[PDB]
RNA sequence: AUCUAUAAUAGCAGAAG
RNA sequence: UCUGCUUCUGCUAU
RNA sequence: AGUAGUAACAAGA
């Protein structure tokens, strides 16, 4: 338990939330109105998050994720599932995005352990993670620390906050913009070999105040379902050639990349990539959702459908008609207002309408 | 003793009196439901948010002298709470599960006896080979659980209560024989029981009570095959398997009858039908058992079952089943028609209407009767049951078999002839179990006529009694072997004497689903599969090889229509329309080879398989072409895309009923030009609509033209076009 | 099962506006047979009332337009692609485990 | 390379990949404070589309009445609520004419419903508004609520047991001079206009956890006086939507894909060669703002001809009740100062003596406009449905729209039928050419507008005939399969260990069943599932690492216990489950291979973490020592005082079932009170006891003794 | 062959509208 | 002063 | 401050 001093306090917002008194008592301050209720203010997109997504399909060096056992295989539908489960996990064990699974995961946990057993203490919870490297030896990581304030947590949307230090090595001045809600401090210098040469490189910690619930932190404990998100969509691909060619594809769509599917866009044009980029794709896509969920996000998503549905009618040559076109596009862009997420999938909706229909 | 002294005490009281007294029966559920409190709700949060605490669950203050409060290593186990209630730690579970004391008699295996039953089915279950095929899964009605055989539901849940709570049964009383005998079984075997009566009676249930479930399946529908659904059948696999318990006599006799119905449908098509079934029933195998082993050892009586008996030499037994009665004609003929009618309830509908005279043994097991009928008539009903409930049974039974429009007609209240699930039933059986529970408006409406009392028996009246006066118009009721035979090349079986016996004609069209998987091991293991898999199939097998099929059709076409592969296909055709259809694709496809240019390999590809029977002239123009899936002809248009055959030109994945087929390559020689060779007997579309020669007619409006002239012709979907005649 | 009182009172007004009791709207009921309501209703209404179909063609739609204002700030509850992590090449010390040790 | 997922759709057909465009592992969103803006807002919204409808003032409750019926035909395309009652008929009628004897047949069911249904029904709903407390309860709570004011009113005939009886006793209670209310002991007595406001009262509440939405709305739930009436309507809508091939209700999931599936068949099997085949994928705007209950009503009555005049009757209470109803504000406001820091509540019943400075813009407008409607801290609501609460009998009404497609009704070259699932609809349209699809879908929406239903144009759209969307259903050439949808039911439910276990691997097996759930996928599921699992309940493998409370425990039970393949994943063993297997539960997976003395202690009989029933000798337990009973925290308000009524009711219930042995596994029936039904059981029992020679002379004598002291104290207290 | 149903215990969880 | 109605599906037995 | 987004949390008794 942290010690309760004037700093701790102001950071977790300890005692900002005002006093209830009677509207019989107070019916007659200058001031007093209905909460302030306003629409969100609206963003612009930056360029910021398509890197973040560029990065969360990559592969890493690592295990993530270190799956359990299951019985033995017996029938041979199991061992053709194994093969291609092994697949699977080659897959999605090395994808950035299962790093971002297992630190959401452990967070969230260790979140609401701490809000549960702790309602009136300062917590402090490092931000551990467990990994396995290329040798296969197991690695303890820790991303930095979090304070906890007061956990009273009577509602599920009731919020708890919590201070966050983030060990770093990127300039917070290369792209303010981006870290608007942080204070940034330089904590030290690192020494990184990259090819043959080390450079002393400044280390920053980020330091900000974020709030959560027991929703988004039961939502986030939950995140290992990306995977499944994911993997459901490309082995029913996979199955969907399979029928067509009478055969097991996993081996052939794995391991000689013959079949592609376009997956990015590059000055050159659109970029296919083989299945397992495409898995890590939807998978980074399910794990932006988990981390980015917000109203807007479902409001895009469930509007966007149609618009999705419409351009495949016209792909079908089935000559779609609309009533209301144009208020299908008021309700889509409704829901743009400041989410970043929402509005690199508005971009990636506009770039696949420019592909799609020349 | 106990209870009534209970009972005194809180009567004793005040409030406890004025709740005893002021409360009926029926409220008391209500107060019973009566909670108070903030309700719940999440309980997978709560529990992620409780099993890191000391103490989350609630046990009974007995614990307190089973469990110590404290282990070896000081961790407590419980801890009072300020009442009888505990809170417990989970280390006080596995403290018990490592400590606790031991017995050598647990109920778990009896309690749950059938899911040791599904362990012991997998355990001697047998794996076969995984084929990837193109899987066509349809949505229907199976058992989850099978229950008693002899008990229904109800009956089942009637037999739980009068063996767990006797007493409790209300105005309710047993009335199958089987009911008790199974009653009686279970109370014997229950007695001493320490389970508590509301466990006991859920045991019953699982092993009693039948349950159903609408599924999407694939194989058979048995609940053994159902068990292991996720197992067998998926998107793109079979897995061949065999469950390990004894199968059921009544699944088997079903998958039998379905196999044999669609063997002998697709041996009829074949040149040479007899070696054609032969080899089927040798490739055959149902619930892992060889089809020519359990057809040596079968004794089924159906018509095409009985063709496979007598194909390979058997003794047949020349007789079907209807209505649970064992119908066997003993002379006289008939043919099927389809003949569309209006009930009593205003539902129109078709049914399979057999035309000429014909006379029947109807034996059931407590009634017998002789029948002579003819096209929907009822001629003659001589019964001779034992009791004048299975009297009425078998002229029910009879009636609904004559097919006579009084019975038709006397269909009253709310008789549906379709599924939930808007599925096509069989109109006979909805009859019949119409009928079954109340047929007095069909004993009114049959009508009466005066007897002659000839040979002593005696006539029954609408009423169900009997009457030496007046009967039913042609009942009367009196007081009361497999044979060798033959077949030739067509499947027709003759008798010792000459005569025929049975046909493929005879054969029932409806196409069923097996109860138990039916594996068939050959070229195409899809070959005596249901419709929706033969065309997803057929034309999977024509763009797979679709190279040496696309050079043969222009060097040897008459090779390529007589292909095998195509057998399974026309099966599906109608057969008037068979040679028909035939004549106008080969006409089509040759007019396509005279024309340069004009080459679609989708059209081709769609009208192939229309080709591999015998052609018969005919001047006619279709605009569409039939295939029969499950009682409805679905048309294939013959120009552009449809609903059971459309070719994306964008993804150029052909896709057949919503399964997909594959992708069509680049032909060099493809037609851009826009013209069409192809569509129509003896003309070529050359575009769209020139006003310059006159409105649009009719298809069925070209035979009058003469060669070297133009015309717009509403052909297609609704799109005019101009085509020109040859 | 009677309908009377205050029930009968707001069934009174639970009716279309041209009638004053519920008897009176049953018996209308009961007499109602259909002569053209639906097609003269059709006449009288304006033909501005319509769902007119508007082709869906490959220069119909346009591109979604994002909103304006200052760029987009990270709102993730953890660093995702700046974070850096302190590693132990293997947990093999004492009381291995617990979080605060491995920090 | 810029990765874009939706690229994807470039190759894959939307269909395919549909289950990418549902988000659902992030969490949905919630409300957080009143739902009083969105209650004033939809108040408003229901009088604006029915504005030019005709005034009225209740005679009963004085309140002010909207009626929009018959009004002026619509000039525009807005949503409109001017349904005209002969349009609405003329569609009953052709519904009828065309599916000859539904109404009849579905009125004798009904009435067979209506006869046998107990009261004890209506516990079988959620929270429910309680006009005792003017709060919401438990329905069983609530119900047990309402009875208890009614018989201390004198209003006793729900001591029948059936629901039929208690609307009876609810007709004569809105008869009554005074209601008189006794609380825990302070009695309130509510006049006629009070109680009649509080019975025709739907509490408004926000929906809470609800996906694709941007912006939150409001749900109501209705007090008992309505829910009886609503139900009777509900069943009777419900068997007539049984007999109707369009109806995508009452059938649901595997069923209602093989309904759709099928009728969607048959219709293009109809469709001629020659014939233009279209596709509208459509959604209804504002449908239960625009459903009246006056065409309920309507409705009712035409579906009721030449029906006995009870049964009408009992029919038509519901829309009667609905087109009177008044919707409940909710909770308020919260109003802040910033300079004095602090917040106060200003409740809903004072919004309309209260000035408008306090609020801002669109507050202050929703106040202003509904300020004409508040009687007692409720709005008038006329118009409108208020949220699926005739979900059957709005769909009959889109159905007989659907069934006026018919070329028998059109009378020209096109026509259409379809898929109505209360206000999602399928519309196939068939005509020789374009214009005469246009033209059947310009008269099908203008034939809509006539009956109050809206489509809504922004949410709809047309296609060729082959693929579609129903009720998130998408049909391409056939039903595809939505993984994403079923996506939350995976994870740790929080039952307990073994029952976690089972929903856990039976959800495994059900979605490769049902929602295409890939083998190997299935494998990667089991092992996630597993991991959660072992994490939630401290329950890793005996031969691991992780240190918790439970791992000394578990290490002991490992170590101790020659076959490891034994154990419960519970116990620290190991996971055994496969595709095999799945089907199969874990106690009986691995009974073969348990230890014979971890076998008799995991199965004891005598458990004590389970509860155990008298016959002091009780009944062997057979559930194992993992069907533990999670701790259930309920503890700081004033409603403290029904716990010990609780307590004395679960006294009395756990007696019963001591005289009564088949009271928990069925529904008992009885208009005896308690103590006479369990006196009697009890001189019965102990008669064919003596009889049957189980007692003696002496305690058949004690027995007969207490019966009687029992039965003196009952009429003597 | 039928089988929400020739049917009705209840509670919780997921989905849909 | 706060998870409604309806439908389906799954699990469990105070 | 922060969470968040049409109204709330930033403990309450
Ligand atoms: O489950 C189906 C089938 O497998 C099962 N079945 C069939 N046979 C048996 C036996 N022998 N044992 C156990 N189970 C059996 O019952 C179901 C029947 O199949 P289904 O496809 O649903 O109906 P089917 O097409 O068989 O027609 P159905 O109405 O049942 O009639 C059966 C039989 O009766 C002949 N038949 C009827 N009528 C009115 C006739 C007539 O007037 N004249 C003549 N000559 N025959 C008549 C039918 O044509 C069939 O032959
Ligand atoms: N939870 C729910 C969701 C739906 N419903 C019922 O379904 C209808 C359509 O909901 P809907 O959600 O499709 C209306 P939406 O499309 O959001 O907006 P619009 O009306 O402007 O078109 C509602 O009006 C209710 O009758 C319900 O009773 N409970
Ligand atoms: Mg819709
Ligand atoms: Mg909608």
Same mark, same amino acid.
């Given at each position: ?358 | ?726 | ?62 591109? %979604?337009? @994002?909103?304006?204002?200052? $760029? ?7 660093? #995702?692609? &700046? !974070? %850096?992590? @302190?590693?132990?090449?293997? $947990? ?7 979080? #605060?040790? &491995? !920090? | ?717």
């Amino acid at each position: 338990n942290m010690k309760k001093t004037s700093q701790l306090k102001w950071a977790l917002g300890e005692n900002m939330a005002p006093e209830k008194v009677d509207f019989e008592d107070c019916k007659d301050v200058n001031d007093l109105k209905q909460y302030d209720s306003d629409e969100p203010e609206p963003r612009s997109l930056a360029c910021w998050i398509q890197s973040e997504f560029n990065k969360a399909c990559e592969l890493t060096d690592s295990s993530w994720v270190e799956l359990d056992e299951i019985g033995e295989d017996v029938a041979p539908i199991e061992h053709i599932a194994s093969m291609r489960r092994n697949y699977f996990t080659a897959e999605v064990s090395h994808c950035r995005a299962t790093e971002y699974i297992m630190k959401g995961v452990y967070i969230n946990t260790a979140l609401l352990n701490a809000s549960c057993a702790a309602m009136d203490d300062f917590q402090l919870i490092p931000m551990i993670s467990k990994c396995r490297t290329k040798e296969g030896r197991r690695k303890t990581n820790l991303y930095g620390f979090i304070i906890k304030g007061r956990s009273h947590l009577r509602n599920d949307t009731d919020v708890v906050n919590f201070v966050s230090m983030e060990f770093s090595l990127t300039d917070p001045r290369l792209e303010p913009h981006k870290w608007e809600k942080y204070c940034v401090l330089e904590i030290g210098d690192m020494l990184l070999r990259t090819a043959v040469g080390q450079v002393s490189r400044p280390m920053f910690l980020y330091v900000r105040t974020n709030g959560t619930s027991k929703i988004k932190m039961k939502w986030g404990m939950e995140m290992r379902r990306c995977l499944l998100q994911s993997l459901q969509q490309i082995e029913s691909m996979i199955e969907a050639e399979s029928s067509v060619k009478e055969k097991d594809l996993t081996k052939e769509f794995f391991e000689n990349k013959s079949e592609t599917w376009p997956i990015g866009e590059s000055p050159k044009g659109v970029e296919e990539g083989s299945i397992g980029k495409v898995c890590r794709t939807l998978l980074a896509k399910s794990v932006f959702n988990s981390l980015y969920a917000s109203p807007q996000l479902e409001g895009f998503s469930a509007e966007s459908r149609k618009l999705l549905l419409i351009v495949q009618a016209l792909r079908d040559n089935l000559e779609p008609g609309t009533f209301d076109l144009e208020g299908l596009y008021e309700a889509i862009e409704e829901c743009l207002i400041n989410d970043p997420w929402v509005l690199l999938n508005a971009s990636w909706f506009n770039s696949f309408l420019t592909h799609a229909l020349r | 003793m106990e209870r009534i002294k209970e009972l005194r005490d809180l009567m004793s009281q005040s409030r406890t009196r004025e709740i005893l007294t002021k409360t009926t029966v029926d409220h008391m559920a209500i107060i019973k439901k009566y909670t108070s409190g903030r309700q719940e709700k999440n309980p997978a949060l709560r529990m992620k948010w409780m099993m890191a605490m000391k103490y989350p669950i609630t046990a009974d203050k007995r614990i307190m002298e089973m469990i110590p409060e404290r282990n070896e290593q000081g961790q407590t186990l419980w801890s009072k709470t300020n009442s009888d209630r505990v809170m417990v730690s989970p280390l006080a579970v596995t403290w018990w599960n490592r400590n606790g004391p031991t017995t050598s008699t647990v109920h778990y295996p009896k309690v749950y006896k059938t899911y040791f039953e599904k362990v012991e089915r997998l355990k001697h279950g047998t794996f076969g080979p995984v084929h990837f095929r193109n899987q066509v899964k349809i949505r229907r009605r199976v058992d989850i659980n099978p229950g008693h055989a002899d008990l229904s539901a109800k009956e089942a849940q009637d037999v739980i209560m009068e063996v767990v709570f006797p007493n409790e049964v209300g105005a309710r009383i047993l009335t199958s024989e089987s009911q008790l005998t199974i009653t009686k079984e279970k109370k014997k075997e229950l007695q001493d029981c320490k389970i508590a009566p509301l466990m006991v009676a859920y045991m019953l249930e699982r092993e009693l009570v039948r349950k159903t479930r609408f599924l999407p399946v694939a194989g058979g529908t048995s609940s053994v095959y159902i068990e292991v659904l996720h197992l067998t059948q998926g998107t793109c696999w079979e897995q061949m398997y065999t469950p390990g318990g004894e199968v059921r006599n009544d699944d088997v006799d079903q998958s039998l009858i379905i196999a044999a119905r669609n063997i002998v449908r697709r041996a009829t098509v074949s040149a040479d039908p007899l070696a054609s079934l032969l080899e089927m029933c040798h490739s055959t195998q149902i619930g892992g058992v060889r089809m020519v082993d359990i057809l040596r050892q079968n004794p089924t009586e159906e018509q095409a079952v009985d063709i496979c008996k007598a194909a390979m030499g058997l003794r047949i037994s020349s007789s079907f089943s209807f209505g649970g009665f064992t119908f066997k004609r003993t002379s006289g003929s008939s043919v099927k028609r389809e003949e569309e009618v209006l009930t009593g309830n205003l539902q129109t509908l078709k049914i399979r209407v057999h035309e000429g005279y014909e006379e029947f043994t109807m034996v059931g097991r407590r009634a017998t009767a002789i029948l002579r009928k003819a096209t929907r008539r009822l001629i003659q009903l001589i019964v001779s049951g034992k009791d004048e409930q299975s009297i009425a049974e078998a002229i029910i039974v009879a009636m609904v078999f004559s097919q006579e429009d009084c019975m038709i007609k006397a269909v009253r209240g709310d008789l549906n002839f379709v599924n939930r699930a808007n599925q096509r039933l069989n109109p006979m059986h909805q009859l019949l179990r119409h009928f079954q529970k109340d047929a007095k408006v069909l004993f009114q409406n049959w009508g009466i006529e005066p007897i002659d009392n000839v040979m002593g028996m005696i006539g029954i009246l609408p009423d169900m009694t009997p009457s030496t006066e007046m009967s039913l118009r042609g009942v009367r009721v009196s007081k009361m072997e497999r044979v060798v035979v033959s077949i030739d090349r067509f499947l027709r079986v003759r008798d010792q004497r000459g005569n025929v016996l049975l046909s493929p004609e005879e054969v029932s069209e409806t196409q069923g689903t097996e109860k138990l998987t039916i594996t068939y091991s050959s070229s195409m293991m899809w070959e005596i599969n249901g419709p929706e898999s033969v065309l997803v199939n057929t034309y999977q097998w024509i763009i797979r090889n679709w190279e040496n099929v696309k050079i043969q059709w222009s060097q040897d076409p008459t090779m390529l229509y007589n292909k095998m592969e195509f057998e399974p296909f026309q099966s599906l055709v109608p057969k008037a329309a068979r040679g028909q259809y035939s004549g106008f694709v080969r006409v089509l496809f040759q007019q396509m080879r005279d024309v340069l240019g004009t080459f679609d390999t989708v059209q081709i590809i769609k009208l192939l398989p229309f080709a591999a029977a015998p052609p018969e002239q005919s001047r006619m123009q279709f605009s569409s072409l039939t295939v029969n899936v499950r009682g409805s002809g679905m048309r294939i248009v013959v120009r552009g895309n449809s609903p059971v055959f459309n070719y994306n030109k964008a993804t150029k994945r052909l896709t057949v009923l919503g399964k997909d087929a594959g992708a069509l390559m680049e032909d060099p020689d493809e037609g851009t030009a826009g013209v069409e060779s192809a569509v129509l007997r003896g003309f070529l579309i050359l575009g769209k609509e020139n006003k310059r020669y006159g409105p649009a007619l009719s298809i069925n409006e070209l035979s009058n033209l003469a060669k070297g002239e133009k015309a717009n012709v509403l052909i297609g979907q609704g799109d005019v076009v101009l085509v020109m005649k040859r | 099962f009677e309908i009377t009182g205050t029930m009968r009172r707001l069934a009174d007004q639970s009716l279309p506006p041209n009638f004053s009791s519920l008897e009176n709207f049953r018996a209308y009921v009961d007499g109602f047979e259909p002569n053209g309501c639906i097609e003269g209703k059709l006449s009288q209404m304006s033909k501005e009332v319509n769902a007119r179909i508007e082709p869906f063609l490959r220069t119909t739609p346009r591109p %979604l337009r @994002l909103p304006d204002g200052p $760029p987009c700030s990270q709102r993730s509850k953890f660093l #995702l692609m &700046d !974070a %850096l992590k @302190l590693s132990i090449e293997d $947990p093999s010390h004492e009381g291995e485990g617990i979080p #605060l040790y &491995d !920090a | 390379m810029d990765v874009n997922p939706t690229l994807l759709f470039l190759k894959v057909p939307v269909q395919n990949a549909i289950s990418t465009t549902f988000p659902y592992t992030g969490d949905p969103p919630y409300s957080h404070g009143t739902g009083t803006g969105y209650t004033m807002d939809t108040v408003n919204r229901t009088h604006k589309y029915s504005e030019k409808g005709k005034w009225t003032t209740n005679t009963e409750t004085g309140a002010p009445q909207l009626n929009p019926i018959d009004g002026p035909l619509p000039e525009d395309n807005e949503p409109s609520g001017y349904a005209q009652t002969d349009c609405v008929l003329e569609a009953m009628a052709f519904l009828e004419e065309s599916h000859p004897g539904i109404f009849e047949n579905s009125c004798l069911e009904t009435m067979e419903i209506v006869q046998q249904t107990r009261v004890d029904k209506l516990t079988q709903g959620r929270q429910t508004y309680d006009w005792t407390l003017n709060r919401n309860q438990p329905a069983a709570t609530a119900l047990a609520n309402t009875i208890e004011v009614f018989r201390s009113n004198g209003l006793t005939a729900n001591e029948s047991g059936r629901l039929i009886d208690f609307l009876k006793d609810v007709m004569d209670s809105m008869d009554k001079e005074e209601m008189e209310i006794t609380t825990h002991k302070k009695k309130q007595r509510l006049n006629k206009r009070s109680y009649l406001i509080r019975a025709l009262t739907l509490n408004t509440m926000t929906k809470d956890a609800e996906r694709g939405k941007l912006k939150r709305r409001a749900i109501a739930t209705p007090g008992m006086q309505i829910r009886g009436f609503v139900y009777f309507v509900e069943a009777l809508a419900r068997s007539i939507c049984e007999k109707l091939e369009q109806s995508g209700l009452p059938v649901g999931g595997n069923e209602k894909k093989a309904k759709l599936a099928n009728v969607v068949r048959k219709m293009m099997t109809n469709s001629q060669d020659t014939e233009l085949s279209f596709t509208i994928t459509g959604d209804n705007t504002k449908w239960n703002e625009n459903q009246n209950p006056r065409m309920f009503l309507a409705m009712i009555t035409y579906i009721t001809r030449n029906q006995p005049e009870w049964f009408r009757n009992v029919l038509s209470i519901a829309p009667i009740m609905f087109s009177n109803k008044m919707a409940r504000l909710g909770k308020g406001y919260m109003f802040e100062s910033k300079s004095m820091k602090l917040r106060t509540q200003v409740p809903a019943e004072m919004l309309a003596n209260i000035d408008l400075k306090y609020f801002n813009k669109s507050t202050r407008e929703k106040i202003e406009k509904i300020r004409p409607l508040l009687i007692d801290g409720t709005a008038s609501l006329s118009p409108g449905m208020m949220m699926g609460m005739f979900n059957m009998l709005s769909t009959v009404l889109g159905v007989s729209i659907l069934n006026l497609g018919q070329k028998k009704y059109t009378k020209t070259t096109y026509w259409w039928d379809g898929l109505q699932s209360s206000d999602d609809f399928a519309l196939i349209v068939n005509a020789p050419n374009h214009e005469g699809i246009q033209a059947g879908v310009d008269r099908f929406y203008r034939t809509c507008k006539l009956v109050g239903i809206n489509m809504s144009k922004k949410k709809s759209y047309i296609n060729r005939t082959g693929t579609f969307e129903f009720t998130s259903f998408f049909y391409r050439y056939g039903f595809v399969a939505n993984f994403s949808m079923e996506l939350p039911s995976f994870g740790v439910s929080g039952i307990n260990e073994s029952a976690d276990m089972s929903v856990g691997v039976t959800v495994i097996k059900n979605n490769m069943i049902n929602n295409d759930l890939g083998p190997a996928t299935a494998q990667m599921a089991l092992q996630l599932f597993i991991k959660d699992y072992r994490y939630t309940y401290r329950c890793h493998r005996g031969d691991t690492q992780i240190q918790t409370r439970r791992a000394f425990e578990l290490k002991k039970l490992w170590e101790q216990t020659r076959s490891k393949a034994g154990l419960l994943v519970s116990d620290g063993g190991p996971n055994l489950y496969n595709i095999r297997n799945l089907h199969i539960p874990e106690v009986c997976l691995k009974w073969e291979l348990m230890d014979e003395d971890y076998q008799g202690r995991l199965c004891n009989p005598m458990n004590p973490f389970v509860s155990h029933k008298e016959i002091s000798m009780e009944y062997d337990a057979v559930a194992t020592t993992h069907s533990w009973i999670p701790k259930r925290n309920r503890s700081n308000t004033s409603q403290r005082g029904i716990l010990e009524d609780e307590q004395m009711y679960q006294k009395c219930c756990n007696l019963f079932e001591k005289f009564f042995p088949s009271s928990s596994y069925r529904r008992p029936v009885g208009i005896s009170s308690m103590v006479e039904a369990m006196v009697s059981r009890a001189r019965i029992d102990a008669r064919i006891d003596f009889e049957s020679g189980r007692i003696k002379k002496e305690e058949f004598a004690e027995i007969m003794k207490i019966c009687s002291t029992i039965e003196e104290l009952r009429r003597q207290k």
